[PDB]
Design a protein around this ligand. Structure first.
Ligand SMILES: [K+]
Ligand SMILES: [K+]
Ligand code: NA
Lengths: 99, 99
């Protein structure tokens, strides 16, 4: 399985960030990547179910999801994803990384 | 191969995007994702060696790279990565995409 799954130009990345943030320009962005890639939708379901979280995109081909909301909501969603995948699906996990 | 390879919160994504663009706020961002993930460093080498391209990050564990520069330099670097992985390493490749 040797594949480039994404080779993409974001032509207007500032516009793209405001589009993901929506009305709350004080928001944070959460990003998850995982394998097998098709399980991205389960991360998107967990994040998208939180009251102040919006999904920006889900990509089952690259295995990625991006979402936004207030920082506490985004951190809690990421923790919920790590916990579900580890405890319910036997996935190995990384630390919750912050920038 | 069941792994969460990235679970990341960006607290200030507008500032994050301007730091990645650097001096040229009218710049584009290129993003590559691939498998096996460890080869992401070769994509970052190819992009990074181009005179008008700055690497924003490379993550060998997730298989992703992000880099910035003028739109034509970013597109040329993506084409170069796609040609190298296909022709030198035998990788399957997605089309070069843009949003
Ligand atoms: K929601
Ligand atoms: K360079
Ligand atoms: Na570990």
């Amino acid at each position: 399985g040797k594949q480039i799954t994404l080779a993409h130009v974001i032509a207007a990345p500032i516009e793209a960030v405001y589009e993901c943030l929506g009305v709350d320009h004080e928001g944070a962005i959460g990003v998850v990547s995982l394998t097998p890639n098709e399980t991205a939708i389960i991360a998107a379901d967990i994040a998208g179910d939180a009251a102040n979280i919006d999904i920006c995109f889900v990509d089952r081909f690259t295995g990625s999801v991006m979402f936004s909301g207030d920082i506490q909501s985004v951190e809690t969603s990421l923790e919920d994803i790590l916990e579900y995948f580890k405890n319910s699906l036997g996935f190995s996990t990384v630390p919750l990384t912050k920038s």
